[PDB]
Design an enzyme around this catalytic site. Structure first.
Site, short mmCIF file in Angstrom:
data_model
loop_
_atom_site.label_atom_id
_atom_site.label_comp_id
_atom_site.label_asym_id
_atom_site.label_seq_id
_atom_site.Cartn_x
_atom_site.Cartn_y
_atom_site.Cartn_z
N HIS A 9 79.35 -36.67 21.11
CA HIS A 9 79.68 -36.25 19.75
C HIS A 9 81.04 -36.74 19.24
CE1 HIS A 9 82.81 -33.65 21.35
NE2 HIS A 9 81.98 -33.43 22.35
N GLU A 77 79.27 -29.57 29.53
CA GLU A 77 80.50 -30.17 30.03
C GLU A 77 80.95 -29.47 31.31
OE1 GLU A 77 82.08 -32.60 30.62
OE2 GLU A 77 83.45 -33.12 29.00
#
Lengths: 207, 217
Positions: A9, A77
């Site tokens: 992103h 993540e």
């Protein structure tokens, strides 16, 4: 050959890890740009981290392709433990050499967090599942349509190194993914599949 | 304490060489390959390169010249940036090679120590090109220097060379060199070399920043 695209992103609103930070409005328009670009490669499937910075980016690709966005927390993540929400200066003040060591040791984790090796261990099975469950992927009819994983910089470096079968000592050779960037591996004739690095950290806003 | 090293692969080559393995055969750019070189010059030119070093093979050199023209830099030519010599396979198609030596071409890709007869292995290519990078580190104090530390050195070369040299600088074991795929037409790669001031060439830690991004952007 099976193509595997991984998308990071754009801009968000200081260590994030698994904290659920939002895209900025710039980050939102970067998602649109990334969708226009990656949409022309006609993805087979989209899988996304549940964290909104990734998920909101994936949703734009889903809208462009008409594909559902499958969500999977195994694409989250790296959990950065005590570092989460702290600035560099704060971390450096408790451990002057920690961030450096982290960058150079894929087995090192902050307290309460995950190492690159941990992140690869939890994410690698998703790729194996996809090879097993998606016969169209790299199949006879549309062999070039990629599986797209929408995720995070740490995850992408860890999982890529693991798929490429680099020795752990060499995992830090993979730099950091930028804003609105993509990586592509190709799997050639699960365990006997040999992966190679086609693209690392190219801009997804432009083609 | 970081130096950026950009490696540029040219665009499309002449129609008349077809699908033959090129290696050190001196093939020319196509018309498209020439406009791709101009597009790449615009993109890389904005990075403000410090120095440009190029293979002497025309497909690389003519590409480098466009970048030199746009930046005001003169292109240095280094014969150590040449593509892998492919020996008896140079000038041959995939079908010809596979007919003559079944299984060889595919196995070659997976063994960086293996060379076609009369040719070079990826190890050979790295061994001859790595010294250029060391010479540049030694002779260019501005590279990663105080005034403009981010200005990159640009090597204009070839896919086989860029993969071999990159793997060598990253200190990958040769068994893992086939992990790097191919570079596309008009594409770039960037490594960053991080070091402690006063340390030698080998102690520089190289990281892969970008592999095979479009140079036409």
């Amino acid at each position: 050959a099976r193509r595997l695209v991984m998308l990071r992103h754009g801009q968000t609103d200081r260590m994030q890890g698994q904290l659920d930070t939002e895209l900025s409005e710039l980050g939102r328009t970067q998602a649109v740009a990334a969708a226009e670009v990656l949409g022309k490669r006609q993805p087979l499937l989209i899988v996304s981290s549940d964290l909104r910075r990734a998920y909101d980016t994936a949703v734009k690709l889903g809208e462009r392709t008409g594909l559902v966005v499958r969500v999977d927390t195994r694409l989250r993540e790296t959990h950065l433990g005590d570092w989460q929400g702290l600035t560099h200066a704060q971390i450096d003040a408790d451990a002057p050499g920690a961030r450096l060591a982290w960058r150079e040791d894929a087995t090192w984790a902050p307290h309460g967090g995950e190492s690159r090796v941990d992140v690869a261990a939890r994410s690698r099975p998703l790729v194996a599942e996809l090879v097993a469950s998606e016969p169209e992927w790299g199949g006879a009819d549309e062999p070039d349509r990629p599986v797209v994983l929408v995720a995070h910089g740490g995850l992408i470096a860890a999982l890529s190194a693991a798929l490429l079968k680099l020795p752990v000592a060499n995992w830090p050779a993979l730099g950091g993914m930028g804003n609105a960037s993509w990586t592509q591996l190709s799997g050639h004739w699960f365990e006997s599949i040999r992966w190679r690095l086609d693209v690392w950290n190219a801009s997804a806003q432009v083609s």
